[PDB]
Design an enzyme around this catalytic site. Structure first.
Site, PDB file in Angstrom:
ATOM      1  N   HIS B  41      -2.623 -12.918  47.268  1.00 31.76           N
ATOM      2  CA  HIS B  41      -3.088 -12.623  46.331  1.00 31.76           C
ATOM      3  C   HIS B  41      -2.881 -13.727  45.033  1.00 31.76           C
ATOM      4  CE1 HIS B  41      -1.471  -8.938  44.200  1.00 31.76           C
ATOM      5  NE2 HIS B  41      -1.459 -10.286  44.245  1.00 31.76           N
ATOM      6  N   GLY B 143       3.454  -9.495  37.310  1.00 29.11           N
ATOM      7  CA  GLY B 143       4.232  -9.961  37.606  1.00 29.11           C
ATOM      8  C   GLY B 143       5.422  -9.426  39.226  1.00 29.11           C
ATOM      9  N   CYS B 145       4.566  -8.261  41.526  1.00 26.39           N
ATOM     10  CA  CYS B 145       3.445  -8.129  42.858  1.00 26.39           C
ATOM     11  C   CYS B 145       4.616  -8.254  43.769  1.00 26.39           C
ATOM     12  CB  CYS B 145       2.884  -7.893  43.031  1.00 26.39           C
ATOM     13  SG  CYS B 145       1.607  -7.790  41.898  1.00 26.39           S
TER      14      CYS B 145
HETATM   15  C1  LIG Z   1      -0.230  -9.050  41.069  1.00 35.15           C
HETATM   16  C2  LIG Z   1       0.930  -9.535  39.923  1.00 35.15           C
HETATM   17  O1  LIG Z   1       1.802  -8.939  39.582  1.00 35.15           O
HETATM   18  N1  LIG Z   1      -0.311 -10.631  39.628  1.00 35.15           N
HETATM   19  C3  LIG Z   1      -0.863 -11.336  39.926  1.00 35.15           C
HETATM   20  C4  LIG Z   1      -2.354 -11.707  38.786  1.00 35.15           C
HETATM   21  C5  LIG Z   1      -3.662 -11.660  39.778  1.00 35.15           C
HETATM   22  C6  LIG Z   1      -3.748 -12.612  41.065  1.00 35.15           C
HETATM   23  C7  LIG Z   1      -2.149 -12.542  41.651  1.00 35.15           C
HETATM   24  C8  LIG Z   1      -0.472 -11.697  41.004  1.00 35.15           C
HETATM   25  C9  LIG Z   1       0.386 -11.232  38.143  1.00 35.15           C
HETATM   26  C10 LIG Z   1       1.818 -12.611  38.526  1.00 35.15           C
HETATM   27  C11 LIG Z   1       2.323 -12.864  38.464  1.00 35.15           C
HETATM   28  S1  LIG Z   1       0.608 -13.596  37.262  1.00 35.15           S
HETATM   29  O2  LIG Z   1       1.261 -13.632  35.910  1.00 35.15           O
HETATM   30  O3  LIG Z   1       0.350 -14.912  37.438  1.00 35.15           O
HETATM   31  C12 LIG Z   1      -0.092 -12.679  37.761  1.00 35.15           C
END
Ligand SMILES: *CC(=O)N(c1ccccc1)[C@H]1C=CS(=O)(=O)C1
Ligand SMILES: *CC(=O)N(c1ccccc1)[C@H]1C=CS(=O)(=O)C1
EC number: 3.4.19.12
Lengths: 304, 304
Positions: B41, B143, B145
């Site tokens: 993702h 962030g 993930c």
């Molecule tokens: C999973 C996660 O924490 N994030 C995310 C959100 C949406 C799609 C992929 C990953 C965050 C990772 C960094 S962000 O601030 O772009 C969102």
């Protein structure tokens, strides 16, 4: 979201953990630059521990009696000194893994991570507080002494605790890294009772703020209180008295959650007087006091 | 003595944590040998996350679109592939800090340590279980993930979990390191409810064994029970059914404490039917289910 009891990464501290052997006794040491720090009772048998005269016991010891092993390589000891209740072993090689570091003597209520070590090999890591009676509620077996407590500020490891004693009640005593014991404890196997283990009122309020943020809000009430009124309840329930300093420190959480510190105090008051009634706050059935205001802000904002 | 919720040292895993950026999205990656593993993702906006076709989104991406930063040095990406719900980024440099490691798909009830990371920089470490509903009760912000779950067997890091989703209830879902989700969860922002979060009966018994050992014995009773009898009580209280396999696994603790597994079951039964009556076991006001039999043996014997 979600709130967990969370320790600093131990990587920076795993790289300073060595084995210190003196005669038959083998505990853990902390190798920073060209000095290895360990508990001075390394020079003792369990028979010495009933009434040791460390000065006298130390005369009989030489640089070559102290065997320091970092992994599967021995460090050459070129000097030894006693500072309070720790030995400082000067080695010929500086620790290539020495991080930026300070020695800090923490106050009661302050939290820190502990890397449990046996034979200078880390076993696990957990989060603790210096209790108001200068004990810590750890997990420590034989060979766990010289395990260290630390906080981490970005890249700087502040060392606050070295493990020494387990009191007959199975709570733990130890020193800062200048070898000065927290509380009235002494590296001697004697009658040593802990005082009243009071609850760290400010940390409970911080942790209540953490709950609200993380979705758990059932315990919010219509009532507020004063410092003097709340404290009469704190006294009754063996809770640490709340000061204007404690309030000031809870200001950020106050502001973020838009719940006044004294409104949240009134929330706590009711929880003390009425209990939880079989309910839970952040997956806990009692009032957790080992998260600082700073520990909540960090975990709720995600500092690295 | 003393029993604590204890995580593996994260040093070995801190050395594999990198930042993975794709367009605007920046999450954490795991650098092992010449491959960096991250959630797929990473290629998505928060708008893509409502109904993403990863195959189609990935066509538009090239090796040079994936920016991998390990500390303050960028790694050159020479290949990318999708395995299930993770990307594998082949880099031109092998991780000099790669420990011995395996990928293991854990069962529900099994425990593991999590290193929480933001921008590939570790923030803290805590201990978790794979719930019987294939969720975990974590602490994870935006962030976080690509933060990984692991166990450590002496020197070998078994990776069991990569963080992906936070369910609307603020519990957490994720994959093994082959990118297969634990439970029926999908890397899609859709209606996803967790099933019944049942209590890990075997782990509660392990943790009761840990209490006895560590001095807390008030809850021992004169009664015993059968597996079939105990299970009728477990069912009622949404506890996982106890099998002969669970009993066999509790044999070591049984033998060490000389308390029969079924006697301890009868102890638990009474705690379920009568509660704790305002008392505590190992400083906890409820029945803790995130210590394996193996987690108790380890912490009570001091394995490194
Ligand atoms: C999973 C996660 O924490 N994030 C995310 C959100 C949406 C799609 C992929 C990953 C965050 C990772 C960094 S962000 O601030 O772009 C969102
Ligand atoms: C403090 C500690 O764990 N130990 C200890 C006991 C008595 C005197 C000094 C140190 C253990 C260190 C290794 S041991 O097995 O010799 C006892």
């Amino acid at each position: 979201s979600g709130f967990r009891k969370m320790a600093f990464p131990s990587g920076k501290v795993e790289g300073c953990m060595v084995q210190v052997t003196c005669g038959t006794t083998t505990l853990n040491g902390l190798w920073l630059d060209d000095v290895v720090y360990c508990p001075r009772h390394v020079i003792c048998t369990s028979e010495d521990m009933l009434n040791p005269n460390y000065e006298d016991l130390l005369i009989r010891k030489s640089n070559h009696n102290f065997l320091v092993q970092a992994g599967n390589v021995q460090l050459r000891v070129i000097g030894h000194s006693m500072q309070n209740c720790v030995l400082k072993l000067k080695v010929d090689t500086a620790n290539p893994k020495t991080p930026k570091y300070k020695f800090v003597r923490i106050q009661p209520g302050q939290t820190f991570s502990v890397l449990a070590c046996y034979n200078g090999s880390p076993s696990g890591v957990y989060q603790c507080a210096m209790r108001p009676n200068f004990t810590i509620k750890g997990s420590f077996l034989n060979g766990s002494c010289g395990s260290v407590g630390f906080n981490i500020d970005y890249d700087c490891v502040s060392f606050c605790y070295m493990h020494h004693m387990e009191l007959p009640t199975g709570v733990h005593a130890g020193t800062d890294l200048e070898g000065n014991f927290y509380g009235p404890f002494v590296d001697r196997q004697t009658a040593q009772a802990a005082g009243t283990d009071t609850t760290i009122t400010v940390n409970v309020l911080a942790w209540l703020y953490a709950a609200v943020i993380n979705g758990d809000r059932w315990f919010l009430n219509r009532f507020t209180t004063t410092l003097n009124d709340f404290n009469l309840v704190a006294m009754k329930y063996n809770y640490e008295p709340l000061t204007q300093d404690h309030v000031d420190i809870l200001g950020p959480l106050s502001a973020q959650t838009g719940i006044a510190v004294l409104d949240m105090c009134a929330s706590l008051k009711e929880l003390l007087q009425n209990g939880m009634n079989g309910r839970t706050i952040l997956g806990s059935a009692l009032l957790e006091d080992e998260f600082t205001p700073f520990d909540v802000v960090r975990q709720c904002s995600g500092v690295t």
